[PDB]
């Protein structure tokens, strides 16, 4: 496949790949311009819907204007948009399978003018020239008469009805409603029958809308589209009464349901599909079997009939075997989930189809080569700049219930809850429907396979149409009116409180009394849950007026450090299902549960349950049981038998199971999210009160005698505060997504599973009394094998118990929230060094995509685990460019990294991002490090950390709270510094933090640094599992070595070191008495067996050698000592090891025995291979030092 | 995997699956393919 992307509208009309063509059979024509082999595109308005349509026929958030698409700047805009989507469609594997399936899968021809795919007729034509002695009158050639005489139906007529264009695919613009993407069918006939049609997708690629915190991509509408469309093209199109329950209207005061199409879920995907595409299935009609069963009689008139013809084209006789190459549940198991995965886009999850009554809609209009490209979006999904539309203004809304919340007859608040828009049923759907028994009662990602691209591509194009008289039925646009009800209530609904929770003002102020927000004649009050800010509102109320810049930078991280504390409160709580964090303000906001005292106290006393405003929704599938049905049978028989429907009952069982699941998703978890999305709008709106308050404050303080630069420092630490008042907001959001997904997940485990339970077991008395009725009917058995063979079958509570939380998690968890949480990194820079074949790469691996510079003097060596920068040439430098580098007034960061320095003692910068005054710096003083922070306002903290010597690794952790006002400082394993910052003020400084040398060699390994603060904990961990890496180091840090001059310690006493003794004609080694301290130490080699090793390991068998006479240790069992040997075969092959909580120190053993340091003799201590418990556990630690 | 008979190169190949008997119960072979062996490098640990 490949996208004609050489089109505009002012290509000239040349019959091949620009056209005009009439619409349907009606007096209007337009343009089309092939941009593939049957896929079209018509760059104007569609025909069929009107575009004025009466004001009563307006559907709820619809954008309707009769303008759009009516120039030509605009058409070409809209084809090269439809160009560009087809083309970024194309570029993954997946859609080009799709794109090439819809392109082969043309409607099945009929038969010819007669009837039949069979062979032809024959005409003989030219026949020779008579010759002198023959006649020659039969001398011709036979052709066939009807050659390609098939008839195909998907066909556009040019506007002379002369000419005809084989097509699939025409995509028109949007109709009367501008955003809303359609896709109808050429012939109902024809669609519903398996033969195929003709379809056309009214598509609006210029305006998208932004769910949660990112922006739809259109590639994904027009690939639920185009995988609709392939419905029509195969004829698998089920009655329009096919629908199902897909979600209960809890804003009603009836019990009514919304109903979607089995088509819209099959082809949407999301989580809904999940509960239906079951195994095994509760969910079956005869729409599949006679699916597949026409589909099975296509394929096989194809194969036996229109396979053999050598009078057809292979233009069609080749794309009708690649159409019926695949299956019919390759379309069925095909929805928007694994374009979804294979597009890494994320997508609205849950309720996809019934977004319009969760939430309205902000548009926003997209320049396609500007923001959308070959790639999808520009800078991602979520990091896109896309202008709101100015549509938006145009939005007609027409709601479904208008609540009046009445005083005392005076209205107070007026609100609006809109509609799904789908079709309403007011008869329970789960009471009425029978789970089959004889149906599906079998079966106890990969479906785009039998399509090849190269062979799609290889099917010439069709030239010569055949075309069939009828091929179109009609257009007839579907008019609905909206109804809406009226209903008057005392008690205020979370939509009031909602709706109470903004303001079109700007010199507002926060109230917790909601009847005092809308019984305000001024306007001036506004419902917030932020206990915490108004507290601080009102006791800086009457206090002088802000006028310098620090006030100001004090006031703003109040305020931040207010909301943050305020937005982001729960309590964990322990429910059925395990710990539960239940959001503490979740009461005041969406009034629920807030009669008195806490909403925690309520929910604990209370359910899950009371969170709902409809409880008690189940009801009782019918169920359909049959007994058993008596003929004779042996044993053997009759127990296959019996375990043949042992097993069928189990699968029944789990088929009402899943009925009930279903039930639940349905009835029960909708309220659920309705509450998350309600939830999500507070948070939201109290998120956009803060930052109202916050730009006032900053505009009123424009007004003031500050200088220009000192203002731009403002901005720029306020936008910064923006970002960290959104991080929280979404905090906010997810943590109160978890608190609900679990409160659903428990109310399903504590209200709806006994009943399930309950009802299964009044079936399961009568299961086994039909079983035992029939089994005690039969004589052909013994009595003992009788009462083994029914107490063989019989049904425990057990068998119908398919309770599985783990199940029940891992079922409402989409492929959006799998994105998410691989998307999700806590690093705003990962370094990693990759030394690979004279080809060293040095690179951020976190996701953020910082800028690395670095010069070609840098080296890579093997410092602790994995590979780490070398600078040993003098003035060198690294720079890491990032926007989130900058810092700002309220932002928590942290630095982790190793270091080694090789030097010896004056001051060298280290690590700077000091932009002129403000910012924060490490660089190395006297024999230590120290850590300088300093604000734009004059305020320093200077941190001294001592005791770093050159020569060793270490662990430097350096972690900035601004929610805590804490300075946290760890080296290795252990705090060295805990500062209060509360003196610091806003650190905006550069975007690049750099690394120096400045005539130093520094080893620098794991540069790191994240977007929020560290525990002690969290620290430990990382520096103990770091080191985990089976290498044996020295004291220094370093690996250890064999073949190399080393020093021996002890870990009791870290400053002697072992020294040779002579006595009673035998040498030892032992420690240096307290009167002999200037006596050189011993020194030692590590030999192993083979040579080639260089670097000892965890688990490794060795030889020490003591450097004139080359000694080698050996093990005297007269005193268990140690000795020293002048021959190799004679020394002992001692095993090395090491501690993981001790890592530079050591120890050797010996047929599991570590050698120690014995007690004090006569001013010795010798090396001795201990197994009593008088020596302390730390005394056969030891230390080995490169010398 | 499974070594090929001309190439050098094992080439890849679906496991196969239970479908003898039962419906109730699927799974897939794991004994399938070419038996594997680890063998030391330079032999310096203990041999015990």
């Given at each position: 496949m490949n996208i004609n992307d050489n089109l505009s509208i002012n290509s000239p009309v040349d019959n091949k790949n620009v056209v005009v063509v009439r619409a349907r059979k009606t007096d209007t024509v337009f343009k089309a311009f092939k941009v593939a082999p049957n896929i079209w595109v018509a760059p104007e308005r569609y025909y069929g819907e009107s575009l004025s349509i009466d004001e009563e026929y307006k559907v709820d958030g619809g954008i309707y204007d009769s303008n759009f698409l009516s120039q030509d700047s605009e058409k070409d805009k809209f084809l090269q948009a439809i160009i560009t989507l087809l083309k970024r469609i194309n570029s993954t594997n997946a859609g080009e399978k799709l794109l090439s399936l819809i392109s082969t899968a043309i409607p099945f021809p009929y038969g010819y003018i007669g009837g039949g795919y069979y062979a032809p007729n024959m005409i003989t034509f030219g026949s020779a020239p008579k010759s002198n002695k023959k006649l020659n009158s039969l001398i011709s050639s036979t052709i066939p008469f009807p050659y390609a005489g098939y008839r195909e139906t998907n066909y556009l007529s040019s506007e002379d009805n002369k000419s005809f264009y084989a097509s699939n695919i025409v995509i028109f613009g949007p109709g009367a409603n501008i955003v809303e993407n359609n896709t109808v069918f050429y012939k109902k006939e024809d669609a519903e029958n398996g033969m195929g049609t003709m379809t056309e997708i009214w598509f609006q690629p210029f305006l998208t809308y932004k769910y949660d915190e990112f922006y739809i991509d259109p590639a994904i509408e027009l690939i639920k589209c185009l995988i609709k469309s392939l419905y029509f093209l195969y004829g698998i199109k089920p009655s329009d009464d096919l629908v199902i329950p897909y979600r209960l209207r809890s804003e009603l005061e009836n019990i009514e349901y919304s109903q979607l199409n089995i088509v819209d879920l099959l082809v949407s995907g999301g989580i809904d599909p999940k509960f239906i595409n079951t195994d095994p299935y509760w969910f079956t009609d005869n729409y599949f079997s006679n699916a597949k069963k026409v589909f099975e009689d296509h394929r096989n008139i194809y194969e036996t009939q229109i396979e053999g013809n050598n009078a057809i084209g292979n233009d069609i006789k080749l794309r009708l075997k690649q159409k019926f190459r695949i299956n019919i549940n390759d379309i069925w198991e095909l929805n928007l989930n694994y374009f979804s995965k294979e597009f890494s886009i994320m997508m609205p999850d849950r309720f996809n189809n019934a977004l319009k009554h969760f939430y309205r809609k902000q548009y926003y209009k997209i320049d396609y080569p500007e923001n959308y490209s070959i790639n999808g979006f520009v800078n991602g999904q979520i990091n896109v700049q896309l202008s709101l539309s100015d549509r938006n203004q145009d939005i007609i809304n027409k709601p479904e219930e208008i609540i009046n919340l009445l005083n005392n007859n005076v209205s107070l608040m007026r609100s609006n809850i809109y509609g799904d828009g789908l079709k309403s049923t007011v008869d329970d759907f789960y009471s009425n429907y029978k789970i089959p028994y004889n149906r599906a009662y079998e079966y106890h990602d990969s479906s785009l396979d039998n399509v090849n691209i190269g062979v799609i591509d290889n099917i010439p194009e069709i030239i010569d149409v055949n075309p069939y008289k009828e091929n179109c039925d009609?257009?007839?646009?579907?008019?609905?009116?909206?109804?809406?009800?009226?209903?008057?209530?005392?008690?205020?609904?979370?939509?009031?409180?909602?709706?109470?929770?903004?303001?079109?003002?700007?010199?507002?102020?926060?109230?917790?009394?909601?009847?005092?927000?809308?019984?305000?004649?001024?306007?001036?009050?506004?419902?917030?849950?932020?206990?915490?800010?108004?507290?601080?509102?009102?006791?800086?109320?009457?206090?002088?007026?802000?006028?310098?810049?620090?006030?100001?930078?004090?006031?703003?991280?109040?305020?931040?450090?207010?909301?943050?504390?305020?937005?982001?409160?729960?309590?964990?709580?322990?429910?059925?299902?395990?710990?539960?964090?239940?959001?503490?303000?979740?009461?005041?906001?969406?009034?629920?549960?807030?009669?008195?005292?806490?909403?925690?106290?309520?929910?604990?006393?209370?359910?899950?349950?009371?969170?709902?405003?409809?409880?008690?929704?189940?009801?009782?599938?019918?169920?359909?049981?049959?007994?058993?049905?008596?003929?004779?049978?042996?044993?053997?028989?009759?127990?296959?038998?019996?375990?043949?429907?042992?097993?069928?009952?189990?699968?029944?069982?789990?088929?009402?199971?899943?009925?009930?699941?279903?039930?639940?998703?349905?009835?029960?978890?909708?309220?659920?999210?309705?509450?998350?999305?309600?939830?999500?709008?507070?948070?939201?709106?109290?998120?956009?009160?803060?930052?109202?308050?916050?730009?006032?404050?900053?505009?009123?303080?424009?007004?003031?005698?500050?200088?220009?630069?000192?203002?731009?420092?403002?901005?720029?630490?306020?936008?910064?505060?923006?970002?960290?008042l959104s991080n929280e907001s979404q905090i906010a959001i997810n943590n109160i997504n978890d608190f609900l997904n679990k409160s659903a997940i428990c109310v399903f485990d504590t209200n709806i599973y006994p009943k399930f339970i309950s009802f299964m077991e009044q079936c399961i008395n009568s299961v086994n009394s039909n079983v035992t009725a029939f089994i005690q009917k039969c004589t052909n058995i013994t009595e003992d094998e009788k009462l083994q063979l029914i107490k063989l079958n019989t049904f425990m509570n057990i068998d119908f118990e398919f309770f599985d939380i783990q199940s029940i998690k891992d079922l409402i968890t989409s492929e959006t929230d799998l994105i998410k949480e691989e998307k999700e990194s806590d690093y705003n820079l990962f370094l990693f060094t990759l030394q690979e074949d004279n080809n060293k790469v040095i690179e951020d691996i976190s996701g953020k995509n910082t800028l690395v510079k670095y010069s070609d003097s840098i080296s890579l060596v093997y410092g602790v685990n994995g590979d780490a920068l070398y600078l040993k040439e003098p003035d060198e430098s690294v720079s890491f460019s990032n926007k989130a580098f900058e810092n700002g007034l309220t932002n928590s960061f942290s630095i982790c990294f190793w270091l080694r320095n090789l030097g010896e003692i004056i001051t060298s910068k280290l690590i700077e991002n000091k932009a002129d005054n403000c910012g924060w710096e490490i660089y190395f003083e006297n024999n230590g490090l120290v850590f300088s922070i300093v604000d734009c306002n004059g305020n320093e903290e200077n941190i001294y950390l001592s005791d770093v010597i050159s020569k060793n690794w270490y662990y430097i952790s350096i972690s900035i709270d601004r929610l805590r006002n804490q300075l946290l400082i760890f080296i290795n394993d252990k705090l060295i510094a805990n500062q209060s910052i509360e003196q610091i003020l806003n650190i905006y400084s550069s975007n690049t933090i750099s690394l120096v040398n400045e005539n130093n060699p520094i080893y620098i390994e794991g540069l790191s640094i994240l977007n929020r603060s560290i525990t002690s904990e969290e620290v430990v961990n990382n520096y103990f599992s770091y080191l985990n890496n089976s290498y044996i180091r020295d004291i220094s840090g370093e690996r250890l070595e064999y073949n190399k001059t080393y020093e021996l310690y002890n870990y009791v006493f870290p400053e002697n070191s072992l020294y040779e003794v002579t006595e009673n004609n035998n040498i030892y080694l032992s420690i240096k008495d307290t009167n002999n301290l200037n006596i050189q130490g011993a020194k030692f080699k590590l030999i192993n067996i083979d040579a080639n090793k260089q670097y000892v390991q965890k688990w490794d068998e060795g030889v020490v050698c003591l450097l004139d006479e080359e000694k080698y240790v050996d093990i005297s069992s007269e005193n268990n000592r140690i000795q020293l040997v002048n021959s190799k075969d004679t020394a002992k092959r001692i095993i090395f090891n090491n501690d993981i909580f001790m890592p530079n120190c050591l120890t050797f053993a010996y047929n599991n025995k570590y050698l120690s340091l014995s007690l004090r003799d006569r001013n010795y201590n010798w090396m001795i291979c201990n197994n009593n418990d008088n020596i302390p556990k730390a005394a056969h630690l030891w230390a080995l030092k490169g010398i | 995997i499974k070594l090929k008979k001309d190439s050098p190169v094992g080439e890849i190949l679906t496991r196969s699956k239970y479908n003898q008997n039962s419906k109730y119960i699927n799974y897939r072979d794991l004994y399938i393919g070419e038996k594997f062996i680890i063998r030391r490098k330079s032999n310096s640990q203990s041999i015990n």
């Open positions: 009609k257009f007839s646009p579907v008019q609905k009116i909206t109804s809406t009800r009226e209903i008057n209530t005392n008690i205020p609904w979370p939509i009031n409180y909602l709706q109470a929770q903004n303001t079109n003002n700007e010199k507002f102020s926060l109230s917790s009394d909601f009847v005092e927000v809308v019984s305000s004649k001024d306007k001036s009050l506004v419902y917030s849950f932020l206990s915490n800010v108004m507290f601080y509102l009102d006791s800086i109320k009457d206090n002088s007026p802000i006028d310098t810049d620090k006030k100001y930078y004090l006031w703003l991280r109040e305020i931040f450090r207010n909301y943050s504390f305020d937005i982001t409160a729960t309590q964990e709580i322990n429910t059925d299902c395990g710990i539960n964090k239940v959001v503490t303000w979740f009461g005041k906001a969406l009034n629920i549960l807030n009669t008195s005292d806490s909403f925690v106290e309520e929910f604990q006393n209370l359910g899950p349950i009371s969170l709902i405003n409809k409880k008690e929704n189940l009801s009782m599938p019918i169920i359909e049981i049959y007994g058993i049905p008596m003929l004779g049978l042996p044993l053997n028989d009759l127990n296959e038998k019996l375990f043949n429907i042992y097993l069928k009952n189990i699968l029944y069982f789990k088929k009402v199971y899943f009925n009930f699941l279903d039930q639940w998703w349905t009835e029960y978890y909708s309220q659920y999210f309705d509450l998350i999305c309600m939830a999500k709008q507070s948070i939201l709106a109290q998120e956009k009160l803060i930052k109202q308050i916050i730009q006032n404050k900053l505009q009123d303080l424009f007004k003031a005698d500050i200088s220009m630069d000192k203002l731009n420092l403002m901005n720029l630490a306020t936008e910064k505060t923006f970002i960290d | -």
